[PDB]
């Protein structure tokens, strides 16, 4: 069980750790988060009490290094940093633990929610979507645009999600225009799965990462990417049975976790109505359709 110490909390802030969140007061003796489960990616995220504009945060995996948070009063944010001195870090953590100045990652033993949201998400894939190769952790915020949003503007600060475009030469084989447009199986199975992702695990990892950026940062481009990856599967007549069964589980936990009060901005009516009620896979997402119908019947 690993630890992300904080040097201090000089500004009042709501701190997120995965699906959990805590209010910290200006200059409160807060020195970080302990008992973080090993084996998963995590996200530590922030919303300043004085400017709720820019939710921002860091994707990290404690197996890859010793990470801490320190407020930078010049750039005006909480920054993640790596401590390369193992003994310095262990001594910082032991002191803060002994003084009980850390919040405990509040996982219920029964509760598989975070595993279920991050099942296919791997730090090495996050670091290819979020390019900052000198850090082992990845910064995301509310305002970062995607490579696709930028085509239609600072490339270094972009989310390099896989570009999905249903009306593109990549999506449509010459001479199979109607076939490929109405049945996206070619695009899903040959171009995306065999060609770019190599396997359904990488595809699901990107889908899950896009959802979590949408939910945790209100990142609009991430939400677009999450819906596009759902729609590409639901709009394919030919999908491996294991991919459909897994997609139903993935989406079920995403819908279960979504704040009820953000359904209006985070869920695309057209995509969801099409996926559950008109698409080839309209009858393949039993769990998702049941939770959507019981939780968000207005949207449908």
């Amino acid at each position: 069980m690993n630890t992300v110490p904080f040097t201090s909390a000089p500004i009042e802030v709501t701190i997120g750790i995965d699906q959990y969140s805590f209010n910290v007061k200006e200059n409160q003796p807060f020195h970080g988060i302990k008992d973080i489960p090993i084996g998963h990616v995590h996200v530590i995220h922030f919303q300043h009490a004085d400017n709720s504009s820019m939710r921002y945060g860091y994707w990290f995996d404690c197996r890859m290094g010793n990470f801490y948070i320190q407020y930078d009063p010049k750039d005006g944010l909480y920054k993640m940093m790596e401590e390369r001195d193992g003994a310095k870090f262990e001594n910082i953590v032991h002191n803060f633990k002994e003084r009980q100045m850390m919040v405990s990652y509040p996982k219920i033993d029964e509760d598989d929610t975070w595993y279920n949201l991050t099942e296919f998400v791997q730090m090495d894939k996050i670091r290819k979507i979020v390019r900052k190769d000198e850090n082992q952790f990845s910064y995301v915020d509310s305002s970062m645009t995607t490579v696709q949003e930028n085509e239609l503007s600072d490339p270094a600060h972009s989310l390099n999600y896989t570009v999905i475009n249903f009306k593109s030469r990549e999506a449509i084989r010459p001479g199979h225009e109607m076939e490929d447009f109405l049945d996206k199986s070619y695009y899903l199975n040959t171009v995306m799965l065999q060609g770019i992702f190599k396997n359904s695990s990488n595809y699901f990892g990107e889908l899950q990462f896009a959802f979590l950026n949408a939910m945790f940062f209100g990142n609009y481009g991430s939400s677009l990417q999450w819906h596009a990856m759902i729609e590409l599967i639901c709009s394919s007549a030919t999908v491996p049975k294991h991919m459909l069964d897994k997609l139903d589980e993935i989406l079920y936990y995403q819908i279960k976790t979504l704040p009820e009060q953000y359904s209006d901005i985070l869920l695309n009516e057209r995509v969801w109505n099409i996926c559950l009620y008109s698409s080839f896979q309209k009858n393949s997402l039993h769990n998702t359709e049941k939770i959507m119908e019981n939780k968000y019947p207005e949207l449908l």
Partner: protein, 237 residues
Amino acid sequence: GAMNSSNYAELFNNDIKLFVDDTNVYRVTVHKTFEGNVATKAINGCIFTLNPKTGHLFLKIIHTSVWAGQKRLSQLAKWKTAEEVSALVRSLPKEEQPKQIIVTRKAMLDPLEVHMLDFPNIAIRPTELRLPFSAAMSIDKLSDVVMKATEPQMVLFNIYDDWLDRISSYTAFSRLTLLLRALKTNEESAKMILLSDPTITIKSYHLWPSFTDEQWITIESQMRDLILTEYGRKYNV
């Protein structure tokens, strides 16, 4: 974006453009079967592809053989239209390729966009205009070449005959849309007006009669009267 009353002069500028109307591509007669069920029999159709500036009509005849063994024909008809328009564009020399194609029905946008991905600089546009191009099959010579076709065929017409010698494209298009609107509202009455005087004939190489400028004014008034009479019936006003 969409073509409307506000940007109407754009039709007659020097940017090559084509209207595409798919309303006569898939045509059927509905009939009773021996067992008293209903069935359709397809008849020959056509794509109506028109340069509104020049009058050049690219009438692609759609032979019933293209539907044999196919499902969801009304959906296929949009994709076959888009395939044939894309083929026509690729067949034209670059300097003759349109910069815009305006579809008369919004259901043609995605099929045409997907077929034209190779032509990213050709704008595919809808229109708010209610154009009466469905009535093309009320022009006797166009109906005749479609119904007689025994195979897929492209036939080239000038739908304005020689009008552009005397009038502007704007006026030629206005005349054409008024003629087609009349033919669409009351075909019998419209054709009576066009042929009632046997001294005015249709040249072998023309679609419409050889009216003098004064005779066109009379004809155009008779067509407007036809459209208003019919409208006062439809609506009881």
